[PDB]
Design a protein around this ligand. Sequence first.
Ligand SMILES: OC[C@H]1O[C@H](O[C@H]2[C@H](O)[C@@H](O)[C@@H](O[C@H]3[C@H](O)[C@@H](O)[C@@H](O[C@H]4[C@H](O)[C@@H](O)[C@@H](O[C@H]5[C@H](O)[C@@H](O)[C@@H](O)O[C@@H]5CO)O[C@@H]4CO)O[C@@H]3CO)O[C@@H]2CO)[C@H](O)[C@@H](O)[C@@H]1O
Ligand SMILES: OC[C@H]1O[C@H](O[C@H]2[C@H](O)[C@@H](O)[C@@H](O)O[C@@H]2CO)[C@H](O)[C@@H](O)[C@@H]1O
Ligand SMILES: OC[C@H]1O[C@H](O[C@H]2[C@H](O)[C@@H](O)[C@@H](O)O[C@@H]2CO)[C@H](O)[C@@H](O)[C@@H]1O
Ligand SMILES: [Ca+2]
Length: 854
Amino acid sequence: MGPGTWENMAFAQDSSAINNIDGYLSYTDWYRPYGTSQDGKTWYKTTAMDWRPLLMYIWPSKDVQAQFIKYFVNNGYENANYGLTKDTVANINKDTNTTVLANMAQNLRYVIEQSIAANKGTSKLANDINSFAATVPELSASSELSLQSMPNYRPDKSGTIDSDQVIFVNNNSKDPRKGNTSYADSNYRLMNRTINNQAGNNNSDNSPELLVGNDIDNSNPVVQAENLNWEYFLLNYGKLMGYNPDGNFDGFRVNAADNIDADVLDQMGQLMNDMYHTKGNPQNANDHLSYNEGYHSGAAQMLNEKGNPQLYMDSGEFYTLENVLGRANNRDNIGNLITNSIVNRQNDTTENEATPNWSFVTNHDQRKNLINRLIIKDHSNIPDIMGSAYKVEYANQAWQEFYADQEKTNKQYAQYNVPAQYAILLSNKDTVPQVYYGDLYNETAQYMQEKSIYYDAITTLMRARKQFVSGGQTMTKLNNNLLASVRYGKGVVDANSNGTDKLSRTSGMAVLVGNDSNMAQQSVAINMGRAHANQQYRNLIDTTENGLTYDADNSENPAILTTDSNGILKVTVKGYSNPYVSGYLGVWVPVISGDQDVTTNASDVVANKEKTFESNAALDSHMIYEDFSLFQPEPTSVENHAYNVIAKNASLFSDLGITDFWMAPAYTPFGRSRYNEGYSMTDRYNLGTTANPTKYGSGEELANTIAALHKAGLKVQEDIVMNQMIGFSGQEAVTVTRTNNRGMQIHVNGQTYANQIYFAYTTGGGNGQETYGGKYLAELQKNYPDLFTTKAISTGVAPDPTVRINKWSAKYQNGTSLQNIGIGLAVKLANGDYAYLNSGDNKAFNTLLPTAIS
Ligand SMILES: OC[C@H]1O[C@H](O[C@H]2[C@H](O)[C@@H](O)[C@@H](O[C@H]3[C@H](O)[C@@H](O)[C@@H](O[C@H]4[C@H](O)[C@@H](O)[C@@H](O[C@H]5[C@H](O)[C@@H](O)[C@@H](O)O[C@@H]5CO)O[C@@H]4CO)O[C@@H]3CO)O[C@@H]2CO)[C@H](O)[C@@H](O)[C@@H]1O
Ligand SMILES: OC[C@H]1O[C@H](O[C@H]2[C@H](O)[C@@H](O)[C@@H](O)O[C@@H]2CO)[C@H](O)[C@@H](O)[C@@H]1O
Ligand SMILES: OC[C@H]1O[C@H](O[C@H]2[C@H](O)[C@@H](O)[C@@H](O)O[C@@H]2CO)[C@H](O)[C@@H](O)[C@@H]1O
Ligand SMILES: [Ca+2]
């Protein structure tokens, strides 16, 4: 034919002229037409480089077409000679006559082609299309139906929106109005097999499958085998990488243990036991300490019934500390410190009975909640402030406000009684306490450059723990608002015991904590125990009008007090209000010369063939340290890499009694993630390189750091992250439904969507996944065949090592949190049929394209 408008057709019906996502078309994609024109008269053939946005030629509706014309004419594509002025476009809409809309749009292309020629390229055009798309709900985030759009929405301080989710469902339809995404089908996706609902018959926890990101299908047997591969890798990291051969993790902090199929917890425990013979051998289990993150108390029962392959996280203790000591006002009673925990500590004088647990005063999430609460307070007219309207500037402002508030007596945001919270945590029996990096150091400065105001107090408590803390515990109210927590010492079971150990006499501790700042002055009597009669005690910490003292400087008590013939210590006490104490804090330890370590070796405790972790004096001797913050800044040099700073300070951590070092998730971070912290990762096996370090450093430094920590006598755990990945660069056509965090369909302001093709980012994993994914499975099966014959609870089938995951995609994913791309990107014809390009391996339908590009 002669030249004309038919040259709007695609240059060819394949991926060389039409961009596509598994054969589907996107309105925001581009194609190569056969030719183009600036006037309707002369037509030039496209070269292979002359591509054009589909939105110049097709639209999801009349309405959107009218908006496209309106928008472009009002943003630099006005031309009176082609019937396109601000007026004339002024009142066109979906009810404008169809042939005048087509004609306006054809003339607009001529005007756009003049702009392209005038600007020698498509760059301005490309930005004008993106700006336009953002104004159209179905081509942008708002059609995804965020809960943030509800009227009078109150942002959540967590900084994630739980019920902003989509599930990936099966779709092998031949109906072109439904489409087909069968390559993302799964016979698994068993969702919410969490905690006690592992078998699908006990949802008393109601713990959600979905949190944030691309949620991984930990019910898929192939994925379960890949987690074993990943654990094995991390447990042998250094020698598998040819880096420091002693640079191998000893255990795991299990991220989101409440939000993944519980099979993987069983499986991790099984692996650890096969490799290291942990079950029934306290020495081995405790050398490979592992502990599960979670905020659901039902996990205690779950872990006990399983013989405790990991520690339970005692979140109730954390909330009790904050509600009793940490609020400004409406503090719960002091006695709640005794009872409101997974362990009652009123008179705890037995071993191997309590739920093996870890406890904390702060972690990175709790600091985050506080900073976000501040951000939300400071910027209250933005309902999507925790979503896409979040700005790092608001966090910086919040941190400036936080550090200032932390130093005050009358704190508006930061916690009260941080030292007293630690004094309780670090003396408690039947727990592995966890100290937070950000309570020892100003967490937004370069790594370990600035000590926190609480550094002196917490470190004093930490060193004293190693020296003195052991034996039975008794907590008792001295008055309605004041309590004494007493440890009786190594081999001293209870208040009536004489002591069975050479260190019995010179160990034990009394911690006095009150939470009423107006408490009247009074004398109090503390029962140190019958092993501690006529004994000198040092005033380790006492309260003053302005703060704390470590040498009894201007406190109510002297540097030494002495118990009577019954072992009673008499002490003066009162209410104070200063930056360190709102109420009272006092700590007493026996006088010694000089050095003492009450650590109970695991060889000397009762072993139980049915248990892995047991709560006894040997487990109690451990202390965990969380080495990171979410607000930890990017390093400014190799010397400031957290891994190098840590390696340099290895002996310090040992001196403080830390036995188990919790390292940040070390994985390659998604660059555009909010915090660059490692939970939002693109590669599970790349822990950074010299040229491209993570926030924390390179893999080579990590291995050296782990070896340095090992040389100082510590064990090291990795934050392992089975729940999600975030930052895939590969889009996939996936069939989805709008759900809450348990994958149940919901409405949002009366609207919803189900079984829709959505172009989710799902595919990736980096060269790490390509190289290391499933690499160790043949050897795991050779040495430990039981891993791949033990039938999982949730599925009824063993993990499957015959498939290697070299690349992640939707078929291994339960779904994703809303990706902020839009639910209407997928091109549909007038009749509702999905457009489809049959070409290559995309054979679901015959080629069906919009008539505009025929
Ligand atoms: O747009 C393409 C992109 O879409 C998807 O990712 C985006 C998410 O949909 C979106 O929500 C947003 O994600 C943010 C998140 O909103 C924000 O809160 C922050 O997430 C942090 C948590 O704040 C932080 O607490 C931590 O959470 C852990 C927690 O430590 C742990 O103790 C326990 O609670 O489990 C949590 C999960 O392991 O880490 C997360 C992760 O960093 O930051 C997120 C990322 O900035 O933005 C996403 C990216 O654009 C898809 O998933 C992605 O593949 C696509 O590329
Ligand atoms: O005008 C923008 C952009 O167009 C072309 O990009 C094509 C690319 O050639 C295709 O392989 C595929 O990725 O689709 C793209 C459509 O945006 C040009 O090649 C490129 O130089 C130019 O900037
Ligand atoms: O945010 C940029 C970049 O910061 C960090 O890289 C540092 C690097 O560690 C230093 O040695 C030095 O070269 O400066 C770089 C930044 O200017 C992070 O390691 C990296 O993840 C991050 O992308
Ligand atoms: Ca999950």
